[PDB]
Design a binder for these strands. Structure first.
Lengths: 85, 95, 127, 105, 76, 98, 37, 50, 149
RNA sequence: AAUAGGAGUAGCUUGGGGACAUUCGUAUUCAGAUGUCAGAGGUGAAAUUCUUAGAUUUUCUGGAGACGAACAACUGCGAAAGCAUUUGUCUAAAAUACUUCCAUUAAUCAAGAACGAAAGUUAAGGGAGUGAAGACGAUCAGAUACCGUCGUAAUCUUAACCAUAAACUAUGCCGACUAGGUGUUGGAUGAAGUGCUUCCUUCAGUACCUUAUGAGAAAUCAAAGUCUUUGGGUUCUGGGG
């Protein structure tokens, strides 16, 4: 929140560990712990429950996804390509 | 002095206008600035046109055209005789 | 009667190729470049060389059998320049002079509808 | 086409200068050319959709589609040479020797 | 003085003495049994008062009225 | 044209019609038959959609598929909660189906 | 120089090259001061 | 799960058998995929990109 | 012009006389009644004036009644708490902010949204100074939906 | 009700304004073919480079990234930066029209904030062509360059940032008054060509040509004019190198 000037959530790692890596970790960790929108049920309850696996709490459904967020671009491009013909 | 009132181009009411690249040498030049020559030409020589007509299937002759639109940069055009240096008064004359 | 073939003329600054084919264009009849019929195989392939190549093609095409050709012109690689190469007029004049019967003549140079960057920087070729 | 050939058809048209034209330029407004463009596409689509491929090939030769386009588009804004620039096949039935022979003979 | 010029009287909006370009018209359509006040340079579309049929169509620049009606100009 | 027409209608049903949101109330309305039209999201569950469609078909009443999610049908009605499916029970000044 | 940093008009090296040479020099001085302190 | 011969070109696919009937033995690590890049004229062979 | 680069002068001409037309000799009560009906129907004062000119055929209220329409609504106690002008401006700004929430790359929408809100602040400050908005009042984008509801 | 300002309504107003979705064409490039047979690329002239395991060339398919020519301009739009395929959606905009509403709401603005080319930085794609670095062949007195051929970073998109450019109409903005003509783009008004087309009158844009007993150091400038005959309002800036 307003505790840190600019480090944010990687303040848990503190002064230990090189700063640029902490910035890289900050971006991944922010993506990892966000509560995403569930396509099925219309609530922002989709969380990562294990490395490739994202479960929505409300509708209790497991979507297999990317490592640090639900979707890559690659799958979307493939999906659209299949749909168009 | 300041030689160009208009910048040598259709500068008016516009910021960016895309560069084209010179036909002679690939030099970038704004489409507004660029020296454009249409060049409607036939491939045939006069003797060749006579020979093609004589050789021809059909009497009717379609006369194959070249349609170019060849764009020159300033440096090329003055070198290759598509423009001159005119004269200080004559630099405004659109003939 | 009479049989039509297709005479491709691909004319560029380095060389002007005369390549005659079937009416389909699927099957070749003669490949002759221009540079092969240059004596020392160098330079640009002159109007004279362009004439000699076209004469050889005409002799060969008559030898093979075909009596008539539709002409397909192509200028300097299209994207590089749209200019007809040096020998192109001479080659066309040579084919007409030779005695072959001349059907349709078209420019079929590949033409960019679009645009893309070409060799040398934004300053262009300095030489 | 009624006989199941899927095509793409490309039609050009130029503005015409009608009764009086002291003004040298004879460009049309963007709203107008969009309206012309929309109208043109529907006429092409209608003429194609009705008929079989053979009849469409016959319509192309004297430029009948262009003639109908010209007649309608003079009401919007006078036009000049309306031709078909290209036709390309998308999805062509390539079989049925009997139908081919029947059309040929 | 500037007053004897007849031309300037019709040139954009404000003049020597500004006065409206717009005017009122008494319009009637057969079968409506009415002749009715209407404004040249109206913007809201108008139906007849006694029946459902159209009176005037307004448009950009004055009004276009209709050709189904006959129109007296209505003046002071 | 179509998206404007459905939103205008939805605004008119909000303004002067009567309508009702959510699965149970909509089911009750269809069974009663006092409804005229059900507007259902594609993000309504497959079975729930299927059931509502059968109920509508049974009662000889209208269903319209909405292009937009469960939340979006709610945001159109200016409500934070997802609607998913709603039933018109009195038309606005513009008839929603007509 | 003044605000018209440019305007090559009589007898001097290129402004852009002076600006580059001085930027490079400035970096070297900034390193030397950083080294020292 | 489809035979690779019946894939459109430029499809992205994964779990490729090393040879037919070998149960997704190639292209199986995280985020991996193969692309179908061409089909033989005779239809015996199909050309893929690892 | 305040923010645009134009200076367009299309406007109401107005006749020399402030006297009633020959055509209509109507009583003040008839004119008040006609306005009251439009007001009751939910039309807003600009719409009422436009309608009064077109639908009812009458020259504008300040000429035929000698008093302004807003003032007549205020005298009967029925005038709207939020200004018509302020209402449309806030509604446009809300529309832009809804759109901006969806689309973060629309720079012109962002530019106009700050511009329009700045215009709202200026109009609001003038209405506060004329004591038409409370002393404690301030514009906020959070409450803007509530303002025009 | 200010030829101040705002707001509204109206018109199948306007436009390459902004955003999102969508879609088309073509070349280039690659792969799959295809028919050929010796050189082809390449330039001041060559060599580097590629080619008998079939190059170059032809024609067909398929893929891929890329781009939007011609039309297309002393042309349109945008606050500037900037903006050109198709159709749709979400948005804004100016002028016109108004016997529509408000009733001084304004102008220019230190502080502060927004948007802000190119390149660079950091992360994912993509890496076609072009191609800082770099590599060779030459070239040359030397060449670490121009030229030739190859070629990573970059160019493109998405996600962050960065906050400058001859970011130039090289002319701060608002406001009035000044001078003709040729034009030109968006509206409104009238008439004659055959409802529409044209033309006339008028508004808001917008250039050019000529003229300034206007200006200026002159170039030039219709603003850089109405300024020693010096004061419409205001922000910013410079004080020899």
């Amino acid at each position: 929140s307003r505790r840190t000037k600019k480090v944010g959530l990687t303040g848990k790692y503190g002064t230990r560990y090189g700063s640029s890596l902490r910035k890289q970790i900050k971006k991944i960790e922010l993506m990892q712990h966000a509560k995403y929108l569930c396509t099925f049920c219309g609530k922002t309850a989709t969380k990562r429950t294990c490395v490739g696996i994202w479960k929505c709490k409300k509708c209790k459904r497991k979507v297999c996804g990317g490592a640090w967020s639900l979707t890559t671009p690659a799958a979307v491009a493939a999906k659209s390509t299949i749909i168009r013909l | 002095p300041k030689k160009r009132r208009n910048g040598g181009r259709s500068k008016h009411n516009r910021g960016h206008v895309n560069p084209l690249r010179c036909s002679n040498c690939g030099r970038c030049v704004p489409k507004d600035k660029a020296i454009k020559r249409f060049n409607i030409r036939n491939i045939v020589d006069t003797s060749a046109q006579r020979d093609i007509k004589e050789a021809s299937v059909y009497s009717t002759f379609q006369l194959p055209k070249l349609y170019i639109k060849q764009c020159y940069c300033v440096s090329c055009a003055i070198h290759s005789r598509f423009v001159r240096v005119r004269s200080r008064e004559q630099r405004r004359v659109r003939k | 009667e009479l049989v039509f073939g297709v005479a491709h003329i691909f004319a560029s600054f380095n060389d002007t190729f005369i390549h005659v084919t079937d009416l389909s264009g699927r099957e070749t009849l003669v490949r002759i470049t221009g540079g092969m019929k240059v004596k020392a195989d160098r330079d640009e392939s002159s109007p004279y060389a362009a004439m000699m190549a076209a004469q050889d093609v005409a002799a060969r095409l008559k030898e093979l059998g075909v009596t008539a050709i539709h002409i397909k012109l192509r200028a300097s690689g299209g994207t590089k320049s749209k200019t007809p190469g040096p020998g192109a007029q001479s080659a066309l004049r040579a084919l007409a002079r030779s005695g072959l019967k001349i059907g349709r003549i078209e420019d079929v140079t590949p033409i960019p509808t679009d645009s893309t960057r070409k060799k040398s920087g934004r300053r262009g070729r300095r030489l | 086409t009624l006989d199941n050939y899927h095509l793409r058809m490309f039609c050009i048209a130029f503005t015409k200068k009608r009764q009086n034209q002291t003004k040298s330029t004879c460009y049309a407004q963007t709203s107008q050319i969009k309206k012309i463009r929309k109208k043109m596409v529907d006429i092409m689509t209608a003429e194609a959709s009705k008929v079989l491929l053979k009849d469409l090939v016959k319509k192309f030769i004297p430029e009948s589609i262009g003639k109908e386009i010209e007649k309608q588009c003079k009401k919007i804004y006078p036009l000049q040479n309306v031709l078909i620039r290209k036709v390309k096949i998308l999805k062509r039935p390539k079989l049925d020797i009997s139908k081919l022979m029947e059309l040929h003979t | 003085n500037p007053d004897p010029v007849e031309e300037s009287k019709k040139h954009k909006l404000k003049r020597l003495i500004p006065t409206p370009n717009s005017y009122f018209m008494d319009v009637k359509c057969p079968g409506c049994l009415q002749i009715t006040t209407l404004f040249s340079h109206a913007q809201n579309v108008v139906l007849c008062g006694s029946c459902n049929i159209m009176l005037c169509q307004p448009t950009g620049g004055k009004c276009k009225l209709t050709e189904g009606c006959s129109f007296r100009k209505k003046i002071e | 044209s179509a998206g404007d027409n459905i939103n205008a209608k939805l605004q008119l049903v909000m303004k002067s019609g009567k309508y009702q949101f959510g699965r149970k109330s909509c089911l009750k309305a269809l069974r009663t038959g006092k409804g005229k039209l059900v507007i259902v999201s594609s993000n309504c569950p497959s079975i729930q959609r299927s059931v509502i469609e059968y109920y509508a078909m049974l009662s000889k009443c209208g269903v319209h598929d909405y292009h937009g999610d469960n939340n979006d049908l709610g945001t159109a009605c200016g409500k934070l909660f997802r609607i998913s499916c709603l039933v018109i029970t009195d038309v606005g000044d513009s008839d929603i189906i007509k | 120089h003044g605000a018209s940093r440019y305007k090559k008009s009589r007898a001097k090296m290129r402004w852009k090259w002076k600006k580059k040479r001085t930027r490079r020099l400035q970096k070297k001085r900034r390193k030397m001061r950083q080294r020292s302190r | 799960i489809l035979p690779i011969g019946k894939m459109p070109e430029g499809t992205l696919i994964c779990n490729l058998e090393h040879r037919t009937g070998n149960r997704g033995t190639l292209v199986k690590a995280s985020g991996c995929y193969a692309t179908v890049v061409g089909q033989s004229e005779d239809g015996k062979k199909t050309k893929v990109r690892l | 012009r305040m923010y645009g680069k134009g200076k367009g002068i299309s406007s109401s001409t107005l006749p020399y006389k402030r006297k009633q037309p020959s055509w209509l000799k109507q009583k003040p009560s008839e004119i008040e009644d006609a306005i009251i009906k439009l007001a009751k129907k939910g039309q807003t004062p600009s719409q009422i004036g436009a309608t009064l000119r077109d639908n009812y055929g009458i020259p504008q209220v300040k000429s035929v009644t000698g008093n302004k329409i807003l003032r007549i609504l205020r005298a009967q106690g029925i005038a709207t708490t939020i200004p018509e002008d302020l209402y449309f401006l806030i509604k446009k700004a809300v529309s832009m902010r809804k759109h901006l929430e969806k689309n973060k790359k629309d720079k012109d929408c962002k530019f106009r949204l700050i511009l329009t809100e700045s215009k709202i602040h200026r109009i609001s400050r003038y209405y506060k100074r004329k004591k038409l908005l409370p002393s404690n009042w301030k514009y906020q984008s959070s409450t803007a939906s509530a303002l025009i509801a």
